[PDB]
Paper text:
Then, another series of compounds (12a–12h) were designed and synthesized, introducing also an adenosine moiety and exploring the distance between the three groups. We also report crystal structures with various PRMTs supporting the observed specificity and selectivity. On the contrary, we were able to cocrystallize the compounds in the complex with both PRMT4 and PRMT6.
Structure determinations and refinements revealed that only compounds 12a, 12c, and 12f are visible in the active site of each monomer of the PRMT6 dimer. In all the structures of the complexes with PRMT6, the electron density for the compound is always better in one monomer. Compound 12a is the only one for which a complete electron density is visible in one monomer of the PRMT6 structure, whereas for 12c and 12f the electron density becomes fragmented after the guanidine group and the density for the methyl-4-hydroxy-2-naphthoate moiety is weak. The crystal structure revealed an unusual distorted U-shaped conformation adopted by compound 12a (and probably also 12c and 12f) in the binding to PRMT6, with a folding at the level of the guanidine group. Whereas the adenosine moiety lies into its canonic binding pocket, the guanidine group of the compounds is unable to reach the PRMT6 double-E loop clamp because the linker with the sugar is too short, even for the longer compound 12f. Instead of binding in the arginine substrate pocket as observed with PRMT4, the methyl-4 hydroxy-2-naphthoate moiety is sandwiched between the adenosine and the side chains of Y50 and Y51 residues of the α helix motif I. Hence, the binding of compounds 12a, 12c, and 12f affects the proper folding of the PRMT6 alpha-X helix containing the motif I (Y50-Y51-X-X-Y54).
Author numbering:
A (entry chain A): 43 to 377
B (entry chain B): 54 to 301, 308 to 376
C-alpha cells in the first residue's frame, strides 16, 4: 500500500499526467462549459475542488463568479497550482490547499463541489471515494455537485484493430513469401485468451449493436459509497446490427453537469461514437471471436468491482449470453 | 517472447524485415549450398529467407516457446527437410555440425539494451566455421546533437493554455522543463531530420566476428566525437542510434532514414543550452551494462558545448 501511495504521489507530482488531462480538449472544454453555465448556482458562492491538480477547474469556478474556491490537491503539483492561481491574479478568491481532501480543514462548509475524478473504465484508480468523502464532510445540505452524475454504457464490438492483428499472420505470405497462417490460432489465444481489461480507442464502426446504459451513479446520494464496495453494475440486452465476428464488449462512461435544460443537460461522453478522449474505452475480449448475425440477441450482466488485492484496481465481472449459445462468464481486471 | 506481440511488432517493422530479407537474399552467392544457424529464430521467418537464398541447411535455434510455432511455419512452407527448428538456448543446443553462416536479429533499443548480442557471440565461437558469414556482420553507432521539436511543443504547451481556455499557465514551463529533461533516463523516441543539429558522428563500431568482443562489451563500447552545429537552436541533448551492415546493404535506425521500431535513444541535458551556427560540440559516449543488471543499458555521456565547461550525465534505460 505505501508503495502504491508513493507511486501515485510521484505520478501526479509530475507534469505528464496533467499535460495529458489539460490537452484533452473534449474533457477540459466540457468542464469549462459545465462550470460557466452554472454561474447562477455559483455566483457569490463557495466551491471545493477535490483533487485540483494545476488548479484550472478552480479558476473556471472563479470565472463563473464564485466568491471563494478551495483547491485541494494531495500531490506536489499543489505548488504549481499555487503559482498558476497567483499568475492569474486569483489567490484572494482561489485558495490552494495541499494534502488529501479527507484531512483538509476548511473554514466553512461549501455551496458546491467540483471534481474531475474519473479513471479508465470510470472506476479504475478513480477519485470517486474522495469526492464522496468530501460531499459528506464539507458540502452544505442541498449543495451542488459538478458533474452531478456518471452513467456507464456497454456495447458488443467487432474490433477492426484486433481483426487486423489476428489476420496479420495470414497476410505475411503476400508481403514476404513466407506462409504464416498457422500462427492465427496462437495469436488469438494471446490477444483474446487473457483476462485483462484493454484500454483502447474504438470507432463507431466497431459497435455491433445499440449501446446500452447499464448503471448510473448519482453523486449526491448517501450510501453510494457502500454500493461501490458491493459493485456498480447492471444487466443489458441488445440486438446485433449485422454479421460480424463478436470480439467482446466495450465499456465507457459519461458524466452529466446540472443546470441549463433540465431535460437536456451538458454531457461529457467517452463513447466511441463521440469525439475521442484520453480515457478511450475499456475493452472486454471474449476468449475467441463468436460469429453473430443481424438481430442476434446478446444479453448479460456487467459489474465493476474493486480488486481483492487492491480496492483501487478495477475488476469487471462479465456474464453474457450470445443468442443460442449457453451463458458464459469472464472475470477481468485492469493491469 | 512466448507471446505474439513482440514477434508481430518485429515482422510489422517493414524497414527491418525488408532489409533482413534483402540482406539474406542478396547474399545468395555466398549462401548457395551452405549451412546456416539462425540464432534466436523466433517464428523462423529469417530461416526461410535463408532457404530461399539457396542455403542447403538451416538450424533455427529458439529458446522460447515460440519454437513450436516456427516448427509449424517451417512445415507449412514445405522446408522440414532443410530447416530444422531446435528448441532451447543456443549456448547449450547441440548442432550436428559447424555452420558456414549465422543469421540473427539481435539488436535492442540503443543497440545493446536487453539485446541478444551475447548469444550471437557465443554461437559464433562455438559453431561458425573460420571466417564464416555473419548476417549482419557489424554494427555502427552514431551520435548527433538534437533540438527535439516534440519536446519544444511539450514545453511550450503551458504558454498556449491561455489561448485554448482563458487561463494563464505560462509559469508551468520551468517545472515541465525540469520534469522532462532533469531526469537521467534514456528516452526512446523517434526524431526526424529537423531535430538533428549537426552532422551525425560515428563513434564506435562492433565487429561480430571478433573473439574478444564479449569481454569488451563489459568494459563499455563507445568513443569520442566532435561536430559543429548547423545553426541557432536550443540544444536539448543527443540522439544515439545504430545501423547494421550485411556483407555484400545497411539497416539504419537514423532519424534521417525511414522509421523503425527501434526509433532513437535520446539523451537529454538537464536544461536546454543555446547554440549557434558552428558552435563546437565534442565529447564521448560509452554504452555500458548497468551495475544492477548487465542486460540493462547504461550510457555515460561526457560533453563540451563551445565555451561552456565539460559536463557529464549518466543515463540508464
Ligand atoms: C491521511 O490519509 C488520508 O486520509 C488519505 C491519504 C491519502 O493519500 C489518500 C489518497 C487517495 N487517493 C489517491 O492518492 N489517488 C491518486 C490518484 C488519483 C485518481 C485519479 N484522478 C485524478 N484525475 N486526480 C486529479 C488530482 O487529484 C489528486 N488527488 C488524488 N486523490 C486526492 C485526494 N484524496 N485529495 C486531494 N487530491 C487528491 C491527484 O494528485 C491529482 O493531481 C484517496 C484518499 C486518501 C486519504
Ligand atoms: C545457458 O543459457 C544462457 O546463457 C541463456 C542466454 C540467453 O540469452 C537466454 C535467452 C532466453 N530467452 C529470452 O527471451 N531472452 C530475452 C532477451 C532477448 C532480447 C532480444 N532478442 C530478440 N531480438 N529476439 C530473437 C529471439 O531470440 C530468442 N532468444 C534469445 N536468447 C536466445 C538464446 N540464447 N538462444 C536461442 N534463442 C534465443 C528470443 O526468444 C526471441 O524469440 C532464454 C534462455 C537463455 C539462456
Amino acid at each position: 500500500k505505501s508503495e502504491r501511495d508513493q507511486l501515485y504521489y510521484e505520478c501526479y507530482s509530475d507534469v505528464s499526467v496533467h499535460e495529458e488531462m489539460i490537452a484533452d480538449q473534449v474533457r477540459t472544454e466540457a468542464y469549462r462549459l459545465g462550470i460557466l453555465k452554472n454561474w447562477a448556482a455559483l455566483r457569490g458562492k463557495t466551491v471545493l475542488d477535490v483533487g485540483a491538480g494545476t488548479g484550472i477547474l478552480s479558476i473556471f469556478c472563479a470565472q463563473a463568479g464564485a466568491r471563494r474556491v478551495y483547491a485541494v490537491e494531495a500531490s506536489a503539483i499543489w505548488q504549481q497550482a499555487r503559482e498558476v492561481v497567483r499568475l492569474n491574479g486569483l489567490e484572494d478568491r482561489v485558495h490552494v490547499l495541499p494534502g488529501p481532501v479527507e484531512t483538509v480543514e476548511l473554514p466553512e462548509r461549501v455551496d458546491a463541489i467540483v471534481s474531475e475524478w474519473m479513471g479508465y473504465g470510470l472506476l479504475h484508480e478513480s477519485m470517486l471515494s474522495s469526492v464522496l468523502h468530501a460531499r459528506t464532510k464539507w458540502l452544505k445540505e442541498g449543495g451542488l455537485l459538478l458533474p452531478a452524475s456518471a452513467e456507464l454504457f456497454v456495447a458488443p464490438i467487432s474490433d477492426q484493430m484486433l481483426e487486423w492483428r489476428l489476420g496479420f499472420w495470414s497476410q505475411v505470405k503476400q508481403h514476404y513469401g513466407v506462409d504464416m497462417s498457422c500462427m492465427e490460432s496462437f495469436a488469438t489465444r494471446c490477444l483474446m485468451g487473457h483476462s485483462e481489461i484493454v484500454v483502447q480507442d474504438l470507432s463507431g464502426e466497431d459497435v455491433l449493436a445499440r449501446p446500452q446504459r447499464f448503471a448510473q451513479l448519482e453523486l449526491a446520494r448517501a450510501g453510494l459509497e457502500q454500493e461501490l464496495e458491493a459493485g456498480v453494475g447492471g444487466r443489458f440486452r441488445c440486438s446485433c446490427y449485422g454479421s460480424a465476428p463478436l470480439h467482446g464488449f466495450a465499456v465507457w462512461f459519461q458524466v452529466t453537469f446540472p443546470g441549463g435544460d433540465s431535460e437536456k443537460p451538458l454531457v461529457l461522453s467517452t463513447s466511441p461514437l463521440h469525439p475521442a478522449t484520453h480515457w478511450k474505452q475499456a475493452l472486454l475480449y471474449l476468449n475467441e471471436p463468436v460469429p453473430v448475425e443481424q438481430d442476434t440477441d446478446i444479453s448479460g450482466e456487467i459489474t465493476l468491482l474493486p480488486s481483492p488485492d487492491n480496492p483501487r484496481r478495477l475488476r469487471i465481472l462479465l456474464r453474457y449470453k450470445v443468442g443460442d449459445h449457453e451463458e458464459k462468464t469472464k472475470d477481468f481486471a485492469m493491469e
